[PDB]
Amino acid sequence: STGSATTTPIDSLDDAYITPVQIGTPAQTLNLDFDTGSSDLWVFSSETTASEVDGQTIYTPSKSTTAKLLSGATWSISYGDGSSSSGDVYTDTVSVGGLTVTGQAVESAKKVSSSFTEDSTIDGLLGLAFSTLNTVSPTQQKTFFDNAKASLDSPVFTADLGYHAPGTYNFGFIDTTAYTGSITYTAVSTKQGFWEWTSTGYAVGSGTFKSTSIDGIADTGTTLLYLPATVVSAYWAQVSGAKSSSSVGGYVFPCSATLPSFTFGVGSARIVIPGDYIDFGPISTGSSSCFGGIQSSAGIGINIFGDVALKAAFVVFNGATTPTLGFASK
Secondary structure (H helix, E strand, C coil), X not given: CCEEEEEEECCCCCCCEEEXXXXXXXXXXXXXXXXXXXXXXXXXXXXXXXXXXXXXXXXXXHHCCCCEEEEEEEEEEXXXXXXXXXXXXXXXXXXXXXXXXXXXXXXXXXXXXXXXXXXXXXCEEEECCCHHHCCCECCCCCCHHHHHHXXXXXXXXXXXXXXXXXXXXXXXXXXCCCCCCCCEEEECECCCCCCEEEEEEEEECCCCCEEEEEXXXXXXXXXXXXXXXXXXXXXXXXXCCXXXXXXXXXXXXXXXXXXXXXXXXXXXXXXEECHHHHEEEECCCXXXXXXXXXXXXXXXXXXXECHHHHCCCEEEEXXXXXXXXXXXXX
């Protein structure tokens, strides 16, 4: 089997991407944030604290003839940005882009933090990291990909995020029309539960390539590119007036600037992030100070190849017995 779904930015900055997902019978369609940096599929629901729902579409298990309470199971998660959610668990039928999993753990939110409530466009998350990170207790549950893997034509999914535009998540096949040149594959460590790999280095604009190992995760659920402070300093030094602001919470730059591109290495291959991708606009409405899309990972504990990086490429998440990652230009 295969599946193919379109993923759409939630706003003009590509702050996140939502993908429609069919849950239950009859289908309830929710727009979920496909997150290769976590491993829970959780949704706003009929069980969510009423004061914590503000415009999201909710999953109502009682209206699904295929929903079954997973007795005794609970979940609770906190993300790197400080947001959180928790609740109980059902199993139900979940389809993505024509690909169907029966008995998928659907985690129903009883509580969500303000950042989720405040984002009306995201109805939940669909985790695509390794199932070892799934928070369901006392019986850990598998991701959608993990459940579908054996039935897929090929045990892979791919991420093709758009810049200021829709893109695609495919399951079970590699669309050879969706990228240019060849896909370069690189090793993955699953030891932290992430799609963790090592970039071979970087360049700033038309500058020379610096060969250096940068360990990080391919994370569709993070907006920006988080890299070591040395790398990030070298980038923003090429932007007149750019500075790191503790009050804002990272590098800002004059909105009048033209940003240089940023290249990262995948083995011997190179992915170029155009400068435009690194502009996340005024820090506040009407400001001439703009927020940078490349930020320091110091204090995060890990480097994150977030959407800023990933949207510049066609990315293969290969879930073979020995997982790997593939990157192509597009």
